[PDB]
A paper describes a structure:
GBA is primarily responsible for catalyzing the degradation of GlcCer by hydrolytic cleavage of the β‐glucose moiety from the aglycone to yield free ceramide and glucose. This is achieved with retention of β‐anomeric stereochemistry of the released glucose unit through a Koshland double displacement mechanism using Glu340 as the catalytic nucleophile and Glu235 as the catalytic acid‐base. Here, we report the design, synthesis, and structural analysis of a range of cyclophellitol epoxide and aziridine inactivators and activity‐based probes (ABPs) for human β‐glucocerebrosidase (GBA).
In addition to a previously reported structure of rhGBA in complex with the O6−Cy5 tagged cyclophellitol epoxide ABP 9, a serendipitous co‐complex of O6−BODIPY tagged ABP 5 and N‐acyl aziridine 3 was obtained in this study by accidental soaking of rhGBA crystals in complex N‐acyl aziridine 3 with additional ABP 5. In the resulting co‐complex, clear electron density was observed for 3 bound covalently to Glu340, with its ring‐opened N‐acyl chain bound in the narrow active site cavity flanked by Gln283 and Tyr313. Specifically, the BODIPY tag binds at the dimer interface in a hydrophobic cavity formed by Leu241, Tyr244, Pro245, Phe246 and Tyr313, which we reported previously to accommodate the Cy5 tag of ABP 9. The unreacted cyclophellitol of 5 sits exposed at the surface of the protein, making no hydrogen bonding interactions with the enzyme; however, the hydrophobic face of the cyclophellitol unit lies above the exposed side chain of Leu241. In combination with the previously reported structure of rhGBA in complex with a Cy5 tagged ABP 9, this ABP 5 co‐complex provides further evidence for a unique binding mode of this hydrophobic cavity, which has recently been exploited for the binding of a novel class of pyrrozopyrazine activators with chaperoning potential. Considering these preferences and the structural information provided by the co‐complex of 3 and 5, we suggested that binding of the O6‐substituent and aziridine N‐functionalization are structurally exclusive and may reflect the enzymes specificity for a lipid substrate with two acyl tails.
Author numbering:
A (entry chain AAA), B (entry chain BBB): 1 to 497
Amino acid sequence: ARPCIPKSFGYSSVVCVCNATYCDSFDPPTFPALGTFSRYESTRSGRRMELSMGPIQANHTGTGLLLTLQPEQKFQKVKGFGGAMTDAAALNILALSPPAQNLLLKSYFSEEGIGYNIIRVPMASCDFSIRTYTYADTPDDFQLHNFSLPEEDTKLKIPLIHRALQLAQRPVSLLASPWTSPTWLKTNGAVNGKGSLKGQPGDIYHQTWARYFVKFLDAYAEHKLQFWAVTAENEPSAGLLSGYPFQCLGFTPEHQRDFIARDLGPTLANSTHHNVRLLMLDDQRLLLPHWAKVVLTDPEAAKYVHGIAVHWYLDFLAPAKATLGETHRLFPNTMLFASEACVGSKFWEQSVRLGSWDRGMQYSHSIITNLLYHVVGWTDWNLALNPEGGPNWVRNFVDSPIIVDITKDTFYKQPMFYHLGHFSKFIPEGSQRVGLVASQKNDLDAVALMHPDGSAVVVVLNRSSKDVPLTIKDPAVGFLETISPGYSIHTYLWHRQ
Amino acid sequence: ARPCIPKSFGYSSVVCVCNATYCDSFDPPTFPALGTFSRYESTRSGRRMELSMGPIQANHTGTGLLLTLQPEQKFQKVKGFGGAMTDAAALNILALSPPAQNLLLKSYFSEEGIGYNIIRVPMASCDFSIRTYTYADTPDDFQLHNFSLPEEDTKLKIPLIHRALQLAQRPVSLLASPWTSPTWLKTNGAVNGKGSLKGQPGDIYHQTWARYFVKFLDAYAEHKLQFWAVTAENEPSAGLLSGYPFQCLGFTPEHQRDFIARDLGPTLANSTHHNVRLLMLDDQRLLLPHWAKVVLTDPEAAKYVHGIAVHWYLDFLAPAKATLGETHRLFPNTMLFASEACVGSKFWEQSVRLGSWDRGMQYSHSIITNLLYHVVGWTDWNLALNPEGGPNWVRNFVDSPIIVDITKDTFYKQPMFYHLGHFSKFIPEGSQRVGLVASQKNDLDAVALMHPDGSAVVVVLNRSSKDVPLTIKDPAVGFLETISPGYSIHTYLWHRQ
Ligand SMILES: [C][C]1[C]C([C])=C2[C]([C][C][C][C]C3=[C]N([C][C]4[C]([O])[C]([O])[C]([O])[C]5O[C]45)N=N3)C3=C([C])[C]=C([C])N3[B](F)(F)N12
Ligand SMILES: *[C@@H]1O[C@H](CO)[C@@H](O[C@@H]2O[C@H](CO)[C@@H](O)[C@H](O)[C@H]2NC(C)=O)[C@H](O)[C@H]1NC(C)=O
Ligand SMILES: *[C@@H]1O[C@H](CO)[C@@H](O[C@@H]2O[C@H](CO)[C@@H](O)[C@H](O)[C@H]2NC(C)=O)[C@H](O)[C@H]1NC(C)=O
Ligand SMILES: *[C@@H]1[C@H](O)[C@@H](O)[C@H](O)[C@@H](CO)[C@H]1NC(=O)CCCC
Ligand SMILES: *[C@@H]1[C@H](O)[C@@H](O)[C@H](O)[C@@H](CO)[C@H]1NC(=O)CCCC
Ligand SMILES: *[C@@H]1O[C@H](CO)[C@@H](O)[C@H](O)[C@H]1NC(C)=O
Ligand SMILES: *[C@@H]1O[C@H](CO)[C@@H](O)[C@H](O)[C@H]1NC(C)=O
């Protein structure tokens, strides 16, 4: 292993400094002997996913908090964890020297990093781009004869995706989402602002737009990349808003329902890409459960929809139970998947806060809340940004788990990187959430899952200043006696046989 | 009566221009015989609370939407409507020549204007102040011997409140709310940031803070002003947030519960001000019903709490039914009151948009939703701001129904002014919300109330671009045939006998 090189920028915790010749890394994965548990610990005080091991005790006495595993209480199976290969992310990564590029990609995708198995790929330009382009900017090209991938795909995004997949030992799933259509398909004739597809579902505008999805998948397939899933549109509610500042395409839930039923569903189903999954919504969870009811109560739409994609924006969240919980209850066979998460700032906070433990705790709290309300996966936004939180053509700067300083050939791994890692590294695809009950009221956030091989994983987050003595009971093996320190996150792993 | 002098600033509608010698005004109220209705109309196209009359007829000629009054279905009684006399509002008003000041105060408080009967008064400084002060900044003065009102109170706020009350045809209710305590009572020793009262409820810090409320009410009573109500703290959740940029004081719901039970309740009850009502929360409705459950399930706190004050800023995240509706169901004898609203505070909102019809529709849509979910009153924020949305010492610039241009001795009455007026002018204190049944699904927002004298008032908001043919039925009078134009608000009034 190689430890964190810590640096303070004057906030609550440190970043880990990486360059062309040095980055913090794990030893290859090891399983703890039966009768023992593994612990990975990160702290505000500066510990970064440090490994320790302890015994599983046969007996326990005391008045202390007990968390009891309920392994027969089975919930959702996990698809995975990752982030977005935006134009901004790819530009920042490829501005580093080649050896630094490889250490950044290994940090995310290697078993000696945090084992990401999802990459979200924008279909052409978004706000995290340095220009507005689509794949078909020739006006009224209904046959899409002038459809092509620009350099942002062929020189930045595609080569980094190939390199990520080569570094990963876990199979990686690609997810594609469009922000805007060509402007000649839109009522307002602009990439941004209030505007939807022209005409009505079933018509030439809607069929052309569905064919654009197939052309995108064809072009990526020519580059030997296959997609797990596409979303119907990034944030369809955005294109309903007057003055929306960047790339968008407005759909009401009724418009999305009818576009899926008449155009996108049939076009994908009749293509060579029929095995690609379709996710609906791809938007703020405040729109649930109404959006799900409108789309999935229509059997002609529902038969094409594999899942519901939700967004997380720290500053503006609807309650999980009324949104995620009620949607699962109405549509239990339609998976919920978190397709975009990032920390934006208030008028009083900077876009990037180097070493913010608070922003780390917000990611991990969010991930736990999502896993407790049926969500099968979690996708960060930009894989990397510069210290301004860019580039971004509308200056919609936000934070990222990895901040690249091109002038120093350096990148900084934020607390958010490690908070995400406590899940992504230790919860492989096919893991199933199981029950975990507290003996008493407590300030901790915790979630338990079982790996495909039947082994246990528990993540415990302490967002309080106080150390909390804790016992985890697993009826199969016994008691894990531990302490959750104030401002810490732990992952516990143990064999059950 | 004097009509609106319209001026466009390139937004969706016009402002009404007022100066030292001219402001748009109403004639005294004059209401017609049984069988006649009054209609006040405002439109994006530029009509401003224009009066027309027509017949309520025995025969029904409409074949569209019917709204039927159900006067036997009775809900909440109304406390009233108004806005906040902040330092910023008082500075802006007093920058006008005295004749212009009088036309502005008459616009809000006179029967020649929109009949405000509520003024919210900050207890010392907030963001809408040009400096940081409290009433007791001399440290370790636990008996508050050095408590005093500065010129902001004695020169600006108090004289303007006297003049408002002189001009009002209705009794005006004053509501007080503190942002911060003296910093020597706080854990962080700062006017802002993450910080609460030192120590624990019942101790010297908490007793001093409760005594500060009595000292404030004593000081205003010496100036012959008496309060209807106080809130336990403005936005108590703000003082729980690291780096909160302006005046705040953090309380968890448990801290608010124990402060009310041990200190504020008993201190107010043992004073000459025992008749002043105490409102809890004074914060976003997303905190309901949880905050209400924590405070009101403790009888020692609940016996001092008259009501729950709500702010509008996270309404889009929190459906009324899940927050206001559920709180009413759990605590049906504890009134809900809307104590703060404004547009221009979100990062996607330009601070001031002179003539914004959208911002007008936001006010009226909020007031209707509130009234349909048991809310008894609705209080705007700053009564007046400058064209930048200030002054504000942290540059938290926002919009206001009246914008003062002091360099031209001019003020502008925004669509928000008229949207608020469609309620404030025509729903006096003690009005009762009654049933209004829609015959079919429609795009209108509507609410019916009955005046203390038994006469009817119905407000109809059309946020759609399409004219809606409408019939209103009063079982005791007959059928009102009308049209709700696209982007209009109407108030209908009629005698029932
Ligand atoms: C750069 C930043 C980043 C960003 C996301 C924005 C935006 C977009 C802000 C969206 C605000 C918002 C409001 N809502 C709730 C709202 C909901 O109440 C509706 O019923 C739904 O149909 C729809 O979901 C929308 N969701 N998001 C923006 C608008 C709309 C205008 C401006 C100027 N900007 B901006 F400031 F430029 N800007
Ligand atoms: C890249 O980072 C590494 C680790 O911080 C730097 O290596 C350290 O350099 C200092 C000063 O030369 C030595 O005292 C340390 O012993 C080195 N540590 C290790 C573990 O090798 C390296 O210098 C950095 N590269 C650049 C170009 O700045
Ligand atoms: C205050 O506003 C009023 C109304 O807009 C202005 O009055 C107008 O003045 C012009 C000449 O300057 C007259 O021809 C109009 O007939 C006036 N209208 C009315 C209804 O009287 C007035 O000038 C403004 N005051 C200042 C100083 O500009
Ligand atoms: C998600 C958007 O799709 C992406 O384009 C933005 O860069 C990012 C930050 O603004 C995300 N936005 C949101 O989640 C919405 C913000 C709340 C209004
Ligand atoms: C209400 C506050 O009490 C007042 O001080 C602010 O000026 C006003 C506008 O910012 C309101 N607060 C907020 O908007 C808080 C942010 C919403 C969660
Ligand atoms: C479309 O593509 C064809 C074939 O490459 C090319 O000849 C034509 O000029 C293009 N038209 C444009 C870019 O307008
Ligand atoms: C506070 O008031 C007392 C009299 O009650 C006075 O003696 C003292 O000097 C005052 N302190 C300040 C700083 O004004």
